[PDB]
Amino acid sequence: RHKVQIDMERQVQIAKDLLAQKKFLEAAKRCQQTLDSLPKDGLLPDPELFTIFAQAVYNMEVQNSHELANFSPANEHDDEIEDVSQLRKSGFHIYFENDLYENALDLLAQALMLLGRPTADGQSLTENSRLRIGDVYILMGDIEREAEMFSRAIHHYLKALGYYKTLKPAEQVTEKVIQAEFLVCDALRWVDQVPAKDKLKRFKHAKALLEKHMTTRPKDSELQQARLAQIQDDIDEVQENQQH
Amino acid sequence: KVQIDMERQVQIAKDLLAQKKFLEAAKRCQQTLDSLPKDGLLPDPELFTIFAQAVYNMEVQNSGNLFRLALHELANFSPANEHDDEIEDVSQLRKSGFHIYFENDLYENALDLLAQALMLLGRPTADGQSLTENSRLRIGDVYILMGDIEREAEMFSRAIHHYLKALGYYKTLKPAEQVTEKVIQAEFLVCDALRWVDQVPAKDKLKRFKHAKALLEKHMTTRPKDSELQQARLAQIQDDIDEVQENQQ
Amino acid sequence: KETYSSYIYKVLKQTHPDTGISQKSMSILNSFVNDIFERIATEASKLAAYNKKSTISAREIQTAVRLILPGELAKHAVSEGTRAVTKYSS
Amino acid sequence: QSRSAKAGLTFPVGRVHRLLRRGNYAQRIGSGAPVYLTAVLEYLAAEILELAGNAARDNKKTRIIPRHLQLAIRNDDELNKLLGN
C-alpha cells in the first residue's frame, strides 16, 4: 500500500485469532510485520503485540522440532521492568533467529516494560495492568521451565505471585495465586541448588494452601487434586530420599 | 551371446523368492532383464513383479537389522473400468541398466519396477477389447503390493489410492472364492491405512468404516474358512469406529 | 494389530519432522508401550486393592509410575501426567 | 473434540481407557486414570524416539531402524533399566 496505515487493535485481534488456531508461524510474522511497520518514534505499541509474538515464537520451538518468599511490587521496586527507552523500534525479524526461547523471553521483557511503565502522576498501576504483569511472568516462567532454566523460572513464578497478591479478592485472582503457588513448586523440584529443607517448607506451604482451597469445594477440584498429588509425592520423595 | 528362456528364468527367480533368498532372486531378474534383446520384445511382467518383491523384502529385512487423496475416490464403490491414467505406454519401459534398482532408495526402486509390470500387464489389446480376467487379477495384486511398499515408504495417501485401485480391478472379476478374499482384504487394507492419513475428515472415515463393517459382517454369515482372521478385522474396524465416534462427543 | 503405532509415528514427526521409521521399529516400540502399560496398570491395580478402593484413579496411576519408572524418568513422567490431567480438567 | 486433544495429548486416551476396562484391573476406572497413563506412555515413547532419532542422525541415516532403537535404549541408564535390552 502507498503507505499502509495500521490499526494496532485490529492487527492484535487477527494475531490472537491466528494463535488460537495453532498457526504459530503466521501469528509471529503478523506481530513482526505490524511492529516493523509502525512509526519508529512517538508511539508506544500495544503490549499484546509482544505477548502474542512471544507465545507464537515460543510455541514454534515446542510444536516444531535466593528465595523471594514474599516479593511484593507494592512495597518493593521491580528491578526487571526496563525503561521504555530500551524498547526495540525495528528489526523484529531477529526473533526468528538463534535461541527462540531467549527471543520469546526478550519479547516478554518488552511487554513487561510497556505494562509496568509507571505513570507521571504517582497513581499506581491499575488492577488490569498488574494482572497482566502477572500473566506475563507466568509465561516467562513456563518458557524457562521448558528451557530448563529452572531457577530463572522459579524467580518469575514468585514474581507472578507477588503481583497476583496485590489484586482485590476475586475468584480469578485466587485461581491465579494457586496456579502460581503450584508452578513455584513444579519448578522447585528440578533445582538441585536449593537445600532439601527449604524445599520441604515450600511444598508444605503449597500443600496446605491447596488443601485449604479444597475445603471450599471449588469448580476445578479435579485439577487441584492433581496438583496436590504431585506436591504430596514430592514431599514423600524428599522425606524418604533424605534421612533414609 | 546367451539364449534366454523367460518362463524358465521366472520359475528359478520365483522359487528363490519362496526360499526367502531375495538378493539371489532380484539378481536373477536383473541379469535376465539386462541380457534380453533390447528391441522387439515385451518381457514377462513377472520378471518385474518378482524383482520388486525381492528388492522390497531385501530392504525390509536389512533395515530390520538387530544386534492429496480425493475424498470421492474414497466414497466410491462402483467397479472402475474407466481410464487408468497410471498405466504407462510401453515406450517408457526400461531396456537396460537394471543394476540401478540395487542403488539408492530400494522402496522407490520396487515401485518403479511395479510401475513397469503394470505397464506390461495393462497393455491395451490389439483389437480393442477389455483386458483378460487374468490380467485384471494381476493388476489388482500389483496394486496391493504398491500400497504395501508405499506404507513402508510412508506414502500413506498413495497407499490408500492403490488399495482403492486394486479394489476396482478385483471387483471387475467373475465372482469366485479367491476373488471375494482379495476383495475383503483390499477393503480392510483401505480401512487400516486410513489411520495413517490425517487429511481425511471424520465423516468420510466413518462412512468407509461402516461400509467395510457391513461387508465383513455379511461375509461372516457365509461361515468362511478364514473366520478367525475376519473376526480380527471386524473388531479392529469397530475400534476405529468407536474412536472416531468419540471425537463426535 | 498395533494400538499405538500410528500415534508413535505422529510423536516422531513432532520430535524429528525430517526423520522416518520402519514398520518393524514401530512394532518393537508398540510392544514397549504395551508392556509399560501392563506393568503400570497392574501395579495400580495392586495399590487400589491395598487402599480398599474399587476405582483406579489418577492417584494410583501416579503412585504406580513412581514404583515402576527409574528415578528421573518417573520425575518427568508424573509431571507430564499432572499436566495432561490439569489441561483435561480445565 | 477428543479427550486426547482436550488433554494436549497425541496418544489415544479413548483406546487407553478401553484397554483398562477390558483389562479388569479394578471394579471401576476413574476418568483421570486414562488421561494420566496416556500422558506417561506418550512421554516415554517421545524419549525413546528422541534418542533413536539422534542415533539415526549420528549414523548419518534418515530412517529409524531397530538397531537405532537398541542403541538409544542401552546407552540411556534409565531406559535400559526400564526396558532391558
XYZ file of C-alpha atoms in Angstrom:
668
model
C 0.000 0.000 0.000
C 1.014 3.645 -0.738
C 1.996 3.786 2.953
C -0.028 1.146 4.770
C -1.939 2.603 7.753
C -2.039 0.311 10.808
C -4.880 -0.257 13.255
C -2.933 -1.885 16.111
C -6.020 -3.232 17.840
C -7.257 -4.942 14.652
C -3.818 -6.415 13.983
C -3.865 -7.647 17.596
C -7.257 -9.374 17.155
C -6.068 -11.036 13.934
C -2.908 -12.269 15.659
C -4.934 -13.656 18.607
C -7.103 -15.399 16.024
C -4.087 -16.929 14.307
C -2.615 -18.015 17.649
C -5.845 -19.631 18.906
C -5.797 -21.699 15.685
C -2.249 -23.058 16.219
C -0.920 -21.108 13.208
C 2.123 -20.047 15.186
C 4.477 -19.049 12.390
C 1.788 -16.901 10.799
C 0.888 -15.214 14.113
C 4.515 -14.355 14.870
C 5.028 -12.888 11.367
C 1.885 -10.767 11.835
C 3.137 -9.183 15.103
C 6.570 -8.882 13.488
C 5.309 -7.101 10.358
C 2.989 -4.896 12.379
C 5.777 -3.862 14.746
C 8.274 -3.191 11.932
C 5.611 -1.136 10.132
C 4.647 1.176 12.993
C 6.141 4.678 13.158
C 9.509 4.451 14.902
C 9.124 7.488 17.177
C 6.447 8.976 19.463
C 4.353 5.841 19.829
C 4.225 3.086 22.430
C 2.864 -0.076 20.838
C 0.173 -2.393 22.222
C 1.783 -4.788 24.718
C -0.267 -7.670 23.304
C 1.762 -7.470 20.070
C 4.733 -8.602 22.187
C 2.959 -11.320 24.235
C 1.185 -12.965 21.279
C 4.507 -12.805 19.392
C 6.305 -14.448 22.351
C 3.675 -17.179 22.609
C 3.796 -17.787 18.848
C 7.601 -17.881 18.731
C 7.741 -20.000 21.884
C 5.198 -22.467 20.530
C 7.249 -22.906 17.344
C 10.290 -24.244 19.210
C 7.882 -26.583 21.061
C 5.443 -27.919 18.402
C 8.010 -27.940 15.609
C 11.298 -29.801 16.281
C 17.708 -16.637 46.817
C 14.114 -17.201 47.973
C 11.733 -14.291 47.201
C 9.279 -15.732 49.771
C 7.244 -12.527 49.786
C 8.103 -10.499 46.691
C 5.754 -7.528 46.662
C 5.648 -4.846 43.959
C 3.539 -2.890 46.494
C 6.452 -2.337 48.914
C 9.420 -3.087 46.607
C 10.782 -1.799 43.274
C 10.593 -4.316 40.404
C 14.139 -4.093 39.017
C 13.158 -6.187 35.974
C 10.862 -3.590 34.350
C 13.217 -1.868 31.870
C 12.931 1.752 30.699
C 10.850 2.320 27.562
C 13.982 3.908 26.075
C 15.183 0.322 25.588
C 12.223 -0.866 23.555
C 13.024 -2.277 20.125
C 11.724 0.006 17.377
C 12.677 -2.063 14.268
C 14.274 -5.314 13.082
C 11.746 -7.666 14.700
C 12.741 -10.377 12.210
C 15.658 -11.314 14.518
C 13.262 -13.080 16.824
C 13.189 -15.930 14.291
C 16.977 -16.358 14.560
C 19.022 -18.308 17.108
C 17.605 -19.168 20.576
C 13.800 -18.990 20.119
C 13.272 -19.359 23.866
C 15.604 -16.403 24.510
C 13.796 -14.451 21.773
C 10.402 -15.121 23.360
C 11.785 -14.098 26.754
C 13.161 -10.828 25.314
C 9.811 -10.134 23.663
C 8.091 -10.586 27.034
C 10.602 -8.321 28.776
C 9.370 -5.687 26.349
C 5.716 -6.420 27.230
C 6.716 -6.067 30.894
C 8.300 -2.702 30.090
C 5.133 -1.236 28.467
C 2.696 -2.711 31.035
C 4.850 -1.775 34.052
C 5.581 1.727 32.784
C 4.996 3.987 35.770
C 2.543 6.879 35.419
C 3.665 10.510 35.650
C 1.288 11.477 38.471
C 2.093 8.939 41.202
C -1.057 6.901 40.534
C -0.080 3.242 40.816
C -0.717 0.622 38.126
C -4.358 -0.373 37.707
C -5.564 -3.893 38.597
C -5.691 -4.805 34.917
C -2.017 -3.860 34.467
C -0.814 -5.837 37.473
C -2.811 -8.930 36.499
C -1.301 -8.606 33.075
C 2.201 -8.219 34.514
C 1.373 -11.392 36.497
C 0.186 -13.312 33.421
C 3.399 -12.186 31.663
C 5.647 -13.527 34.459
C 3.744 -16.846 34.375
C 4.558 -17.061 30.681
C 8.233 -16.284 31.196
C 8.338 -18.963 33.916
C 6.721 -21.534 31.615
C 9.247 -20.843 28.864
C 12.140 -21.053 31.295
C 10.766 -24.281 32.810
C 10.616 -25.607 29.243
C 14.154 -24.269 28.502
C 15.371 -25.823 31.767
C 16.470 -22.546 33.335
C 14.546 -23.732 36.417
C 15.973 -21.189 38.838
C 15.080 -18.376 36.446
C 11.606 -19.971 36.196
C 11.133 -20.007 39.987
C 12.142 -16.339 40.175
C 9.382 -15.378 37.698
C 6.696 -17.589 39.218
C 7.425 -15.943 42.569
C 7.188 -12.529 40.914
C 3.857 -13.549 39.355
C 2.716 -14.483 42.864
C 3.713 -11.074 44.211
C 1.748 -9.244 41.545
C -1.259 -11.504 41.869
C -1.251 -10.849 45.630
C -1.779 -7.100 45.002
C -5.164 -7.565 43.316
C -8.525 -7.143 45.025
C -10.062 -10.502 46.162
C -11.999 -12.411 43.468
C -12.182 -15.963 42.150
C -9.996 -15.343 39.069
C -7.324 -13.914 41.446
C -7.473 -16.925 43.777
C -7.071 -19.269 40.799
C -4.045 -17.270 39.628
C -2.471 -17.246 43.105
C -2.897 -21.014 43.426
C -1.649 -21.614 39.891
C 1.396 -19.513 40.783
C 1.923 -21.236 44.099
C 1.794 -24.581 42.359
C 4.092 -23.533 39.498
C 6.742 -22.440 42.001
C 6.774 -25.984 43.421
C 6.640 -27.593 39.961
C 9.836 -25.713 39.095
C 11.494 -26.126 42.528
C 11.554 -29.911 42.255
C 14.096 -29.553 39.428
C 16.506 -27.301 41.308
C 19.447 -29.065 42.994
C 20.810 -25.683 44.196
C 18.162 -25.248 46.934
C 18.559 -27.193 50.235
C 16.138 -30.077 50.818
C 14.914 -28.342 53.991
C 13.999 -25.161 52.063
C 12.176 -27.370 49.572
C 10.001 -29.043 52.198
C 8.840 -25.734 53.636
C 7.740 -24.551 50.196
C 5.967 -27.840 49.334
C 4.134 -27.976 52.667
C 3.090 -24.332 52.210
C 1.613 -25.043 48.772
C 0.173 -28.300 50.134
C -1.689 -26.559 52.952
C -2.913 -23.819 50.654
C -4.214 -26.439 48.183
C -5.911 -28.422 50.945
C -7.466 -25.171 52.318
C -8.821 -24.302 48.887
C -10.263 -27.873 48.618
C -12.469 -27.478 51.670
C -14.170 -24.674 49.667
C -15.277 -27.291 47.104
C -14.045 -25.402 44.001
C -15.151 -25.931 40.372
C -11.707 -27.301 39.392
C -11.272 -29.763 42.286
C -10.031 -32.466 39.907
C -7.167 -30.354 38.546
C -6.461 -29.040 42.041
C -6.172 -32.676 43.288
C -3.687 -33.477 40.537
C -1.616 -30.581 41.808
C -1.938 -31.811 45.375
C -0.921 -35.351 44.445
C 2.251 -34.057 42.802
C 3.299 -31.910 45.754
C 2.475 -34.765 48.135
C 4.659 -37.216 46.173
C 7.406 -34.549 46.059
C 7.135 -34.271 49.858
C 7.412 -38.050 50.226
C 10.441 -38.072 47.890
C 12.459 -35.552 49.924
C 11.198 -37.102 53.192
C 12.045 -40.698 52.178
C 15.093 -39.945 49.941
C 16.694 -37.895 52.748
C 17.389 -39.023 56.360
C 16.893 -42.532 54.855
C 25.665 -64.403 -26.538
C 23.420 -66.431 -24.165
C 19.961 -67.705 -25.187
C 17.241 -66.843 -22.640
C 14.035 -68.772 -21.859
C 11.968 -66.241 -19.917
C 9.376 -68.622 -18.461
C 12.206 -70.823 -17.071
C 14.025 -67.762 -15.651
C 10.795 -66.620 -13.979
C 10.484 -70.081 -12.353
C 14.011 -70.018 -10.927
C 13.546 -66.489 -9.570
C 10.082 -67.350 -8.219
C 11.459 -70.321 -6.288
C 14.375 -68.286 -4.946
C 11.793 -65.765 -3.719
C 9.874 -68.570 -1.971
C 13.170 -69.727 -0.421
C 13.474 -66.208 1.047
C 16.739 -65.661 -0.875
C 15.865 -62.140 -2.014
C 19.296 -60.944 -3.167
C 19.516 -64.085 -5.310
C 16.032 -63.650 -6.835
C 16.483 -59.933 -7.570
C 19.825 -60.607 -9.256
C 18.242 -63.398 -11.310
C 15.641 -60.934 -12.618
C 18.205 -58.159 -13.109
C 20.634 -60.325 -15.113
C 17.737 -61.741 -17.165
C 16.263 -58.324 -17.962
C 19.720 -56.861 -18.742
C 20.592 -59.640 -21.195
C 17.328 -59.865 -23.093
C 17.371 -58.414 -26.614
C 16.925 -54.643 -26.458
C 14.309 -54.199 -29.238
C 11.162 -56.047 -30.412
C 10.257 -57.975 -27.254
C 7.986 -57.266 -24.313
C 9.318 -59.158 -21.282
C 7.224 -61.371 -18.992
C 5.741 -58.983 -16.351
C 6.564 -61.498 -13.640
C 10.240 -60.607 -14.094
C 9.295 -57.136 -12.775
C 6.805 -58.144 -10.060
C 9.259 -60.706 -8.634
C 12.190 -58.264 -8.905
C 10.133 -55.699 -6.999
C 9.066 -58.068 -4.192
C 12.669 -59.295 -3.919
C 14.176 -55.788 -3.654
C 11.426 -54.827 -1.178
C 11.882 -57.789 1.157
C 15.604 -57.190 0.866
C 15.306 -53.619 2.193
C 12.756 -54.517 4.908
C 14.925 -57.359 6.245
C 18.240 -55.432 6.025
C 16.595 -52.359 7.580
C 15.334 -54.754 10.262
C 18.878 -55.445 11.490
C 19.307 -56.210 15.195
C 22.358 -56.847 17.454
C -3.749 -35.434 -1.719
C -6.452 -38.099 -1.605
C -9.706 -37.396 -3.415
C -12.445 -37.796 -0.832
C -14.847 -39.022 -3.526
C -12.397 -41.740 -4.629
C -12.858 -42.969 -1.067
C -16.641 -42.545 -1.213
C -16.841 -44.557 -4.469
C -17.722 -48.277 -4.632
C -18.711 -48.934 -8.261
C -16.089 -51.029 -10.157
C -13.612 -48.854 -12.074
C -13.387 -49.881 -15.725
C -12.690 -46.210 -16.622
C -9.327 -44.944 -17.913
C -6.395 -45.843 -15.665
C -4.049 -42.853 -16.032
C -1.419 -44.775 -14.102
C -0.727 -47.451 -16.760
C 2.130 -46.053 -18.838
C 2.968 -46.614 -22.506
C 5.493 -49.396 -23.327
C 7.777 -46.792 -24.949
C 8.670 -45.920 -21.323
C 9.875 -49.439 -20.423
C 13.479 -49.782 -19.183
C 15.565 -51.794 -21.637
C 18.988 -51.928 -19.907
C 20.881 -50.911 -16.757
C 18.760 -52.902 -14.317
C 21.611 -52.867 -11.784
C 20.490 -49.406 -10.618
C 17.474 -50.902 -8.818
C 20.016 -52.052 -6.211
C 21.217 -48.471 -5.726
C 19.848 -45.532 -3.685
C 16.301 -45.995 -2.356
C 15.045 -49.558 -2.654
C 11.401 -48.790 -1.935
C 11.416 -46.192 -4.724
C 13.050 -48.848 -6.914
C 10.438 -51.543 -6.193
C 7.646 -49.130 -7.061
C 9.259 -48.207 -10.393
C 9.613 -51.911 -11.178
C 5.956 -52.424 -10.242
C 5.015 -49.458 -12.466
C 6.615 -51.371 -15.312
C 4.723 -54.599 -14.544
C 1.580 -52.503 -14.554
C 2.610 -51.121 -17.940
C 3.142 -54.637 -19.329
C 0.138 -56.366 -17.726
C -2.148 -53.424 -18.516
C -1.236 -53.024 -22.185
C -4.365 -52.356 -24.271
C -5.480 -55.152 -26.606
C -4.602 -55.020 -30.336
C -8.325 -55.191 -31.272
C -9.893 -53.014 -28.544
C -11.392 -55.466 -26.037
C -11.127 -55.290 -22.225
C -8.112 -56.989 -20.644
C -8.487 -60.652 -19.676
C -9.644 -61.643 -16.181
C -6.102 -62.918 -15.517
C -4.547 -59.551 -16.303
C -7.115 -57.765 -14.157
C -6.353 -60.099 -11.236
C -2.616 -59.448 -11.539
C -3.039 -55.685 -11.944
C -5.043 -55.882 -8.694
C -2.262 -57.842 -6.971
C 0.313 -55.399 -8.380
C -1.741 -52.532 -6.906
C -1.961 -54.150 -3.453
C 1.811 -54.594 -3.408
C 2.327 -50.955 -4.363
C 0.193 -49.963 -1.377
C 2.226 -52.200 0.923
C 5.544 -50.730 -0.205
C 4.222 -47.173 -0.033
C 3.032 -47.706 3.542
C 6.537 -48.799 4.425
C 7.838 -45.768 2.495
C 5.475 -43.517 4.495
C 3.480 -42.574 1.392
C 0.169 -43.071 3.130
C -2.092 -41.168 0.711
C -0.790 -43.107 -2.245
C -1.105 -46.348 -0.331
C -4.864 -45.875 0.056
C -5.059 -44.729 -3.573
C -3.560 -48.009 -4.735
C -5.613 -50.204 -2.389
C -8.711 -48.494 -3.842
C -7.305 -49.072 -7.321
C -6.742 -52.747 -6.508
C -10.317 -52.971 -5.267
C -11.597 -51.533 -8.554
C -9.893 -54.266 -10.527
C -10.798 -57.213 -8.291
C -14.403 -56.026 -8.464
C -14.368 -56.457 -12.258
C -13.728 -60.180 -11.939
C -16.205 -63.001 -12.406
C -17.192 -63.916 -8.807
C -15.098 -66.645 -7.180
C -13.772 -67.656 -3.751
C -10.279 -66.194 -4.248
C -11.848 -63.037 -5.771
C -14.041 -62.422 -2.704
C -10.997 -62.949 -0.435
C -8.949 -60.315 -2.308
C -11.976 -58.002 -2.217
C -12.376 -58.351 1.557
C -8.619 -57.989 2.036
C -8.497 -54.801 -0.054
C -11.495 -53.258 1.753
C -9.801 -53.872 5.125
C -6.422 -52.593 3.930
C -8.251 -49.449 2.876
C -9.698 -49.001 6.355
C -6.485 -49.904 8.174
C -4.439 -47.469 6.062
C -6.915 -44.647 6.822
C -5.490 -44.448 10.358
C -2.320 -43.040 8.814
C -3.871 -40.120 6.906
C -4.975 -37.068 8.900
C -6.370 -35.123 5.954
C -9.448 -37.380 5.682
C -12.225 -35.911 7.863
C -14.111 -37.987 10.432
C -17.286 -38.107 8.324
C -15.549 -39.790 5.397
C -13.555 -42.238 7.510
C -16.680 -43.226 9.411
C -18.604 -43.747 6.158
C -15.796 -46.021 4.932
C -15.541 -47.933 8.228
C -19.308 -48.573 8.240
C -19.099 -49.954 4.719
C -16.298 -52.423 5.491
C -18.075 -53.299 8.747
C -21.223 -54.187 6.759
C -19.285 -56.077 4.065
C -17.331 -58.156 6.612
C -20.412 -58.963 8.711
C -22.121 -60.172 5.537
C -19.076 -62.282 4.731
C -19.139 -63.631 8.312
C -22.648 -65.046 7.741
C -21.286 -67.235 4.939
C -19.110 -69.015 7.539
C -15.888 -68.588 5.548
C -12.808 -70.744 6.248
C -10.821 -67.662 7.357
C -13.295 -66.823 10.148
C -10.689 -66.006 12.841
C -8.978 -63.540 10.528
C -12.270 -61.871 9.544
C -13.350 -61.503 13.208
C -9.990 -59.866 13.959
C -10.509 -57.446 11.062
C -14.057 -56.708 12.151
C -13.031 -55.967 15.743
C -10.271 -53.599 14.537
C -12.788 -51.691 12.385
C -15.260 -51.460 15.296
C -12.427 -49.984 17.397
C -11.724 -47.429 14.641
C -15.454 -46.618 14.511
C -15.573 -46.234 18.295
C -12.562 -43.906 18.364
C -13.848 -41.659 15.579
C -17.338 -41.519 17.119
C -15.800 -40.463 20.447
C -14.432 -37.408 18.635
C -18.114 -36.547 17.969
C -18.924 -36.208 21.695
C -2.828 -55.213 15.391
C -0.810 -52.377 16.924
C -2.723 -49.892 19.086
C -0.086 -47.177 19.330
C 1.873 -47.402 16.095
C 0.130 -44.615 14.173
C 0.355 -42.415 17.266
C 4.027 -43.223 17.775
C 4.614 -42.113 14.154
C 2.923 -38.762 14.933
C 5.023 -38.279 18.070
C 8.151 -38.954 15.994
C 7.169 -36.230 13.487
C 6.733 -33.815 16.396
C 10.284 -34.686 17.507
C 12.287 -35.177 14.301
C 9.987 -33.937 11.482
C 12.555 -34.941 8.855
C 13.133 -38.429 10.251
C 11.366 -41.641 9.294
C 10.865 -45.044 10.912
C 10.436 -48.636 9.746
C 7.244 -50.573 10.466
C 9.428 -53.056 12.360
C 10.826 -50.457 14.758
C 7.312 -49.084 15.379
C 6.362 -52.691 16.120
C 9.105 -53.052 18.780
C 8.084 -49.668 20.214
C 4.436 -50.639 20.237
C 5.452 -53.696 22.270
C 7.380 -51.481 24.729
C 4.383 -49.186 25.241
C 2.068 -52.194 25.760
C 4.484 -53.534 28.365
C 4.792 -50.295 30.317
C 1.009 -50.073 30.086
C 0.549 -53.540 31.580
C 3.096 -53.013 34.329
C 1.615 -49.666 35.389
C -1.980 -50.904 35.229
C -1.140 -53.999 37.285
C 0.767 -52.072 39.941
C -2.081 -49.524 40.062
C -4.471 -52.471 40.464
C -2.493 -53.772 43.466
C -2.445 -50.301 45.019
C -6.220 -49.981 44.533
C -6.999 -53.155 46.480
C -4.480 -52.254 49.222
C -6.178 -48.917 49.984
C -9.547 -50.727 49.729
C -10.586 -48.610 46.723
C -12.683 -50.061 43.865
C -11.735 -47.240 41.477
C -8.366 -46.805 39.797
C -7.750 -43.054 39.734
C -5.003 -40.704 38.524
C -3.836 -41.043 42.122
C -2.951 -44.739 41.825
C -1.502 -44.367 38.321
C 0.836 -41.679 39.690
C 1.918 -43.898 42.577
C 2.374 -46.857 40.193
C 4.534 -44.712 37.920
C 6.952 -43.909 40.781
C 7.447 -47.561 41.710
C 7.871 -48.776 38.120
C 9.832 -45.990 36.410
C 13.501 -45.369 37.326
C 14.401 -42.084 39.112
C 14.351 -39.209 36.553
C 12.128 -40.917 34.007
C 9.467 -41.037 36.750
C 10.062 -37.422 37.743
C 9.208 -36.126 34.263
C 6.540 -38.815 33.933
C 4.468 -37.608 36.901
C 4.964 -34.019 35.728
C 3.604 -34.951 32.306
C 0.675 -36.852 33.853
C -0.182 -33.931 36.133
C -0.253 -31.568 33.135
C -2.492 -33.744 30.971
C -4.908 -34.102 33.894
C -4.511 -30.374 34.528
C -5.374 -29.496 30.898
C -8.140 -32.084 30.507
C -9.909 -30.923 33.696
C -9.834 -27.200 32.761
C -13.260 -32.627 20.445
C -11.416 -35.791 21.542
C -10.151 -36.310 25.075
C -6.626 -36.574 23.654
C -6.827 -33.033 22.259
C -8.620 -31.780 25.376
C -5.628 -33.166 27.332
C -2.910 -31.888 24.961
C -2.010 -35.483 24.043
C -1.294 -37.264 20.764
C -1.596 -40.826 22.134
C -5.171 -42.202 22.314
C -6.872 -41.581 25.699
C -10.009 -43.363 24.470
C -8.218 -46.527 23.385
C -6.242 -46.499 26.651
C -9.424 -46.069 28.705
C -10.949 -49.060 26.921
C -7.801 -51.135 27.358
C -8.022 -50.505 31.085
C -11.701 -51.559 31.241
C -11.158 -54.749 29.230
C -8.159 -55.448 31.470
C -10.370 -55.875 34.559
C -7.861 -54.209 36.902
C -10.416 -52.821 39.360
C -14.205 -52.640 39.539
C -14.149 -49.075 38.139
C -11.820 -46.870 36.082
C -11.661 -43.171 37.022
C -11.809 -40.707 34.127
C -8.456 -39.237 35.251
C -6.598 -42.569 35.145
C -6.581 -42.860 31.297
C -5.598 -39.216 30.800
C -2.634 -39.764 33.106
C -1.469 -43.144 31.801
C -1.865 -41.961 28.168
C 0.380 -38.995 29.026
C 3.014 -41.256 30.639
C 3.078 -43.672 27.689
C 3.304 -40.825 25.179
C 6.112 -39.207 27.167
C 8.087 -42.477 27.270
C 7.651 -43.064 23.528
C 8.812 -39.484 22.908
C 12.042 -40.078 24.895
C 12.784 -43.385 23.170
C 12.065 -41.652 19.831
C 14.231 -38.576 20.588
C 17.364 -40.696 21.153
C 16.707 -43.266 18.431
C 16.369 -40.258 16.114
C 19.754 -38.915 17.246
C 21.307 -42.378 16.810
C 19.914 -42.369 13.244
C 21.445 -38.939 12.643
C 24.671 -39.953 14.437
C 24.812 -42.758 11.868
C 24.012 -40.285 9.060
C 20.697 -42.035 8.247
C 17.205 -40.501 7.958
C 15.228 -43.603 8.943
C 14.876 -45.274 12.367
C 15.801 -48.964 12.271
C 15.556 -51.381 15.218
C 19.356 -51.164 15.774
C 18.866 -47.418 16.365
C 16.241 -48.321 18.959
C 18.569 -50.774 20.672
C 21.394 -48.211 20.820
C 19.114 -45.475 22.179
C 17.831 -47.730 24.997
C 21.107 -49.414 26.050
C 23.022 -46.113 26.115
C 20.455 -44.452 28.398
C 20.682 -45.621 32.014
C 17.029 -45.367 32.938
C 15.519 -46.634 29.675
C 17.954 -49.555 29.769
C 16.909 -50.147 33.372
C 13.202 -49.894 32.444
C 13.120 -51.844 29.174
C 16.072 -54.284 29.467
C 17.781 -54.729 26.082
